[PDB]
Swiss-Prot record:
Range of residues in the leader sequence: none
Catalyzed reactions per annotation: a 2'-deoxycytidine in DNA + S-adenosyl-L-methionine = a 5-methyl-2'-deoxycytidine in DNA + S-adenosyl-L-homocysteine + H(+)
Domain SAM-dependent MTase C5-type: 12-325
Enzyme category, top tier: transferase
The protein's name: Type II methyltransferase M.HhaI
GO molecular function: DNA (cytosine-5-)-methyltransferase activity; DNA binding
Coiled coil: none
Top-level taxonomic group: Bacteria
UniProt source species: Haemophilus parahaemolyticus
Subunit-structure text: Monomer.
């Protein structure tokens, strides 16, 4: 989490949908915006949320009437990707029913926020030979919004982890915003080796194996790439060893293998899995954030979340365009 100097969104209100851990909340709250509504149905997630923020997000969203959602200026939603059963009139609003995205849209159509802010996985722009994107695009256009989207990788914004995701930023057409742009990349200076806790606190994550094979020499200088040092078992998902002097591999919420959701790292002669705290850090989160007591849920929650840093940079640029209005 990089801390922002110029608080561009002071005064502007927002809502937290599919809140999860509340990554969007931390990101916009660092730019001065204030939260007025939160929604998330996962029991284990609402718990870690009220632990930090003090409120229990509201329950199941498809049961919430849109006329009961507070006036707000920005709508945040890191929603789950689903295929659409669209054999209808080209693309559009109605062709959304049955999806979770539909809930976003039904809320936009009635509350008209100035901006709509979303994110999804890297292979979203190509899902179903192009028609998943198309639909989200044509639905926004119908509700009278501009549509900007680009794929960014977290190793380009100060976080050492390979991780491409798609960010979508929409502005109502009546605000006439034709100068917005995505953040520029910068050289990386923090590496996995810098995020580790002292060995004492991670002994119980060490995993010994006799079928361990070292394919490469250990790296001496830091690099902005993932460096594979060995294999365990067959050499597939969850059975690869990476260097602590390169970048961390993509955290996953539901991966398998011996080194399950975090991958395995060579740290001081032994091979271990990352701890939840070294996980928060690789996602951008700050040490003041109280993590969930169960290591299993925490790996799920973190692999599903957002890289804080990248969101902060875009939140700043949003405030920018909105705040530039000369005579
Ligand atoms: C990809 S993620 C959360 C990402 C969020 N940026 C965060 O930082 O964790 C999707 C979220 O959708 C929530 N969710 C799925 N279906 C829901 C529903 N019907 N009502 C409320 N929350 C729902 C999931 O539980 C998960 O918390």
């Amino acid at each position: 989490m990089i801390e922002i100097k110029d608080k561009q969104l002071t005064g502007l209100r927002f809502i937290d949908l599919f809140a999860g851990l509340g990554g969007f909340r931390l990101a916009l709250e660092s730019c001065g915006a204030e939260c007025v509504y939160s929604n998330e149905w996962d029991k284990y997630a609402q718990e870690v949320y009220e632990m930090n923020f003090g409120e229990k997000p509201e329950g199941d969203i498809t049961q919430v009437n849109e006329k009961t959602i507070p006036d707000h200026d920005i709508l945040c939603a890191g929603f789950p990707c689903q295929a659409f059963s669209i054999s209808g009139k080209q693309k559009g609003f109605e062709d959304s029913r049955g999806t979770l995205f539909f809930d976003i849209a039904r809320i936009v159509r009635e509350k008209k926020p100035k901006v709509v802010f979303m994110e999804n996985v890297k292979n979203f722009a190509s899902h179903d030979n192009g028609n998943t994107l198309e639909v989200v695009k044509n639905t926004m256009n119908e509700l009278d919004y501009s549509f900007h989207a680009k794929v960014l990788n977290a190793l380009d914004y100060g976080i050492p982890q390979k991780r491409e995701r798609i960010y979508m930023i929409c502005f109502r057409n009546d605000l006439n915003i034709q100068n917005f742009q995505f953040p520029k990349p910068f050289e990386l200076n923090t590496f996995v080796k810098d995020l580790l806790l002292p060995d004492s606190e991670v002994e119980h994550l060490v995993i010994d194996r006799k079928d361990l094979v070292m394919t490469n020499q250990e790296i001496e200088q830091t690099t902005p790439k993932t460096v594979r040092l060995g294999i365990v078992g067959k050499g597939g998902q969850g059975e690869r060893i990476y260097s602590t002097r390169g970048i961390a591999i993509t955290l996953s919420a539901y991966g398998g293998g011996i080194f399950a959701k975090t991958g395995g790292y060579l740290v001081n002669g032994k091979t271990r899995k990352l701890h939840p705290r070294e996980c928060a850090r690789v996602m951008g989160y700050p040490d003041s954030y109280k993590v969930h007591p169960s290591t299993s849920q925490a790996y799920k929650q973190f692999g599903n979340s957002v890289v804080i840093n990248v969101l902060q940079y875009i939140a700043y640029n949003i405030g920018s365009s909105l705040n530039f209005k000369p005579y």
